[PDB]
Amino acid sequence: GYYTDVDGLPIQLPCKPGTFMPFDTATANLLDTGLTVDGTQCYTCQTGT
């Protein structure tokens, strides 16, 4: 659910409304096949959500 942008971060920050961070890259539902979720950046929800 959460993410961490900068290096130093006391607590993991939650993904803001209109975004979704999947668990792993392969275990996802709706991700365009030109990207990979490395955690640090939260991908925006796809049309119809």
Partner: protein, 33 residues
């Protein structure tokens, strides 16, 4: 998903926020003394 191919209740709240940060700053500067 693909991406590209290439007032009345806002300022009164922002002033309250810039006063509640001021209060916190004042409470913090007085504690290191």
């Amino acid at each position: 998903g693909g991406g590209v191919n290439q007032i009345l209740s806002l300022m009164e709240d922002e002033d309250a926020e810039a006063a509640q940060e001021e209060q916190a700053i004042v409470d913090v500067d007085a504690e290191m003394q």
